[PDB]
Design a protein around this ligand. Structure first.
Ligand SMILES: *[C@@H]1O[C@H](CO)[C@@H](O[C@@H]2O[C@H](CO)[C@@H](O[C@@H]3O[C@H](CO)[C@@H](O)[C@H](O[C@H]4O[C@H](CO)[C@@H](O)[C@H](O)[C@@H]4O[C@@H]4O[C@H](CO)[C@@H](O)[C@H](O)[C@H]4NC(C)=O)[C@@H]3O)[C@H](O)[C@H]2NC(C)=O)[C@H](O)[C@H]1NC(C)=O
Ligand SMILES: *[C@@H]1O[C@H](CO)[C@@H](O[C@@H]2O[C@H](CO)[C@@H](O[C@@H]3O[C@H](CO)[C@@H](O)[C@H](O[C@H]4O[C@H](CO)[C@@H](O)[C@H](O)[C@@H]4O)[C@@H]3O)[C@H](O)[C@H]2NC(C)=O)[C@H](O)[C@H]1NC(C)=O
Ligand SMILES: *[C@@H]1O[C@H](CO)[C@@H](O[C@@H]2O[C@H](CO)[C@@H](O[C@@H]3O[C@H](CO)[C@@H](O)[C@H](O)[C@@H]3O)[C@H](O)[C@H]2NC(C)=O)[C@H](O)[C@H]1NC(C)=O
Ligand SMILES: *[C@@H]1O[C@H](CO)[C@@H](O[C@@H]2O[C@H](CO)[C@@H](O[C@@H]3O[C@H](CO)[C@@H](O)[C@H](O)[C@@H]3O)[C@H](O)[C@H]2NC(C)=O)[C@H](O)[C@H]1NC(C)=O
Ligand SMILES: *[C@@H]1O[C@H](CO)[C@@H](O[C@@H]2O[C@H](CO)[C@@H](O)[C@H](O)[C@H]2NC(C)=O)[C@H](O)[C@H]1NC(C)=O
Ligand SMILES: *[C@@H]1O[C@H](CO)[C@@H](O)[C@H](O)[C@H]1NC(C)=O
Ligand SMILES: *[C@@H]1O[C@H](CO)[C@@H](O)[C@H](O)[C@H]1NC(C)=O
Ligand SMILES: *[C@@H]1O[C@H](CO)[C@@H](O)[C@H](O)[C@H]1NC(C)=O
Length: 393
């Protein structure tokens, strides 16, 4: 039986789970801001799309421990990025990007006491701080010492002087996980049952929204059916997500079902009401306020170029040209085994920006969801692992 697919010491399923043989890549694309001064005078932003900066991933399950009479398994999943110049537009240690000053907007947000806010402006004034700043791709991705934060750190040692979109993420894991192994039922293969000791999330408004559904998205139960909907808990996206069957496809020499992230996921629906922290008040279709889980930083999640989002989000920023073939999230799963043969996980990091009377640095900036960068975390099965699998398929 395809019951061969269980996380039990000695199975091939286990080994490929513990030491993933498939090479995963992350490609970074940034939006270079061309008119900072004009943006501050209330004009429409104009951005230029820079990328890729291709990094090959290094993945490994650590701290593995079995449980509940072989029903469960606990582990962490370490991810490290190795830069590939040959596959990139340029050197991230040289190439520059003018974008928003996330540390300053992050600090302005954190302040809701007048004294606190008076202190911050004083520092911005004195230090001649700006809303639009230029850094290397490397500094933006991996971290740079910020002047304002360095000074805050002196008074509040809990506050880090460093900032990066992926700061302290090279080598680390996304917390402790306890997975249900396919021993009790195959449908229950790699199903997440706990994340950081909690069986559910606590940062959303409704019981439904806070649910931890599905697998980490790196695998799925065997014997899938064209009609079922598949759930994924992408830790980074801060909520569970489901994917729906699109069509049949052939990867290497193996059959697959093309599963895509449907529009409904981030649409302004009743089932997505609880993803709106201001007492139900929603920003709009195609965007997620990930502020609660991003330690108060004004981060807004979306899909690249605001694909599957409200037209107003696209009109807002000049240089946004969404399309399905370039911005969608798909995954080609071999139906029999549940093994991902080809995939593309694509999402965008945005900042919620607006004119603040207390902060001259904002000027007359339009109230908007500002694009910073998006990525393409992708996978493609190799001829060696594919041939190995054809024996089973
Ligand atoms: C991670 O995700 C990103 C997307 O966010 C990917 O990057 C994109 O890669 C696309 C291809 O995968 C790029 O799209 C191309 O852009 C070209 C112009 O910039 C355009 O010319 C290309 O069009 C051809 O391909 C289409 C199919 O996709 C065809 O329908 C079309 O007619 C074109 O056909 C070619 O041209 C003639 C006419 O038929 C033929 O003689 C050729 O043989 C045809 N070739 C092929 C292969 O069909 C296409 O739209 C896009 O530029 C790029 N964008 C960015 C920002 O990077 C990453 O690739 C992705 N995955 C990985 C693993 O990297
Ligand atoms: C993202 O957008 C930003 C802003 O537009 C952009 O940054 C700019 O990059 C250019 C280089 O591409 C920088 O220009 C240099 O500036 C220094 C002085 O500050 C000059 O000495 C340099 O002079 C050279 O110019 C020519 C070669 O480029 C030669 O003819 C000449 O002899 C010199 O060698 C050069 O002008 C500029 O400093 C930045 N601007 C800012 C705000 O930092 C960035 O490159 C864009 N990113 C991408 C990847 O497109
Ligand atoms: C996490 O997972 C649960 C279960 O997988 C999700 O809840 C499920 O949501 C669907 C629709 O929101 C419910 O189905 C409904 O069935 C009725 C009856 O046929 C139909 O009228 C509706 O149109 C709809 O199809 C389903 O009952 C419900 N199940 C449970 C156990 O709650 C939940 O939404 C997911 N949460 C996240 C954040 O992904
Ligand atoms: C994105 O989510 C954040 C929360 O993560 C939203 O911020 C919250 O905004 C509300 C207003 O709708 C703030 O509530 C009020 O705050 C004052 C000051 O403390 C208080 O006296 C009032 O009684 C009320 O609670 C709330 O403080 C704030 N939450 C946090 C944690 O900062 C934000 O509005 C969302 N962004 C967008 C663009 O919608
Ligand atoms: C992320 O961490 C990894 C592991 O420390 C880095 O990759 C290796 O480590 C050193 C870095 O100087 C070098 O031997 C090679 O670059 C890598 N070797 C192997 C065998 O992987 C990686 O460079 C770090 N990435 C970033 C973005 O800093
Ligand atoms: C698998 O095999 C033996 C069972 O005696 C055990 O010592 C070993 O540590 C197990 N492997 C893992 C990764 O736990
Ligand atoms: C996993 O699934 C099987 C049947 O689908 C069931 O017996 C088992 O209790 C499941 N666990 C949970 C908590 O859903
Ligand atoms: C979202 O939908 C609800 C009704 O379903 C509506 O009250 C709300 O204003 C809509 N959000 C936006 C941003 O228009």
């Amino acid at each position: 039986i395809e019951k061969k697919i269980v996380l039990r010491n000695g199975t091939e399923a286990f080994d490929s789970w513990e030491k993933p043989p498939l090479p995963v890549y992350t490609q970074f694309y940034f939006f270079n801001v061309t008119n900072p001064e004009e943006i501050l005078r209330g004009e429409t932003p104009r951005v230029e799309e820079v990328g890729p900066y291709t990094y090959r991933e290094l993945r490994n399950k650590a701290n593995i421990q079995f449980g509940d009479n072989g029903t469960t398994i606990s582990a962490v999943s370490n991810k490290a990025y190795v830069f590939e110049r040959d596959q990139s537009v340029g050197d991230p240690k040289i190439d520059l990007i003018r974008t928003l000053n996330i540390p300053v907007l992050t600090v302005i947000e954190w302040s809701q006491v007048h004294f606190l806010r008076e202190i911050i402006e004083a520092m911005l004034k004195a230090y001649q701080q700006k809303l639009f700043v230029t850094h290397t791709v490397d500094e933006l991705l991996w971290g740079y010492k910020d002047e304002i934060l360095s000074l805050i750190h002196v008074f509040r040692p809990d506050i880090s002087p460093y900032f990066g979109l992926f700061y302290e993420k090279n080598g680390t894991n996304d917390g402790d996980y306890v997975f249900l192994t396919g021993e009790d039922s195959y449908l229950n293969f790699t199903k997440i049952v706990e994340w950081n000791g909690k069986t559910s999330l606590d940062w959303w408004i409704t019981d439904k929204c806070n649910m931890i559904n599905g697998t980490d998205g790196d695998s799925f139960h065997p014997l899938i059916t064209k009609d079922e909907v598949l759930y994924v808990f992408p830790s980074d996206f801060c909520r569970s997500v489901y994917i729906t069957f699109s069509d049949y496809e052939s990867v290497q020499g193996l059959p697959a079902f093309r599963y895509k992230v449907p529009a409904e996921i981030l649409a302004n629906t009743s089932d997505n009401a609880g993803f709106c922290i201001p007492e139900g008040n929603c920003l709009g279709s195609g965007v997620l306020n990930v502020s609660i889980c991003k330690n108060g930083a004004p981060i807004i999640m979306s899909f690249p170029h605001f694909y599957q989002a409200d037209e107003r989000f696209v009109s807002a920023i000049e240089g946004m040209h969404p399309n399905q073939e370039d911005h969608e999230t798909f995954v080609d799963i071999n139906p029999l085994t549940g093994i991902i043969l080809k995939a593309a996980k694509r999402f965008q990091i945005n900042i919620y920006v607006k004119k603040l009377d207390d902060f001259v640095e904002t000027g007359d900036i339009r109230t908007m969801v500002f694009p910073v960068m998006y990525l393409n975390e992708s996978v493609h099965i190799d001829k060696e692992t594919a041939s190995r699998l054809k024996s089973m398929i």
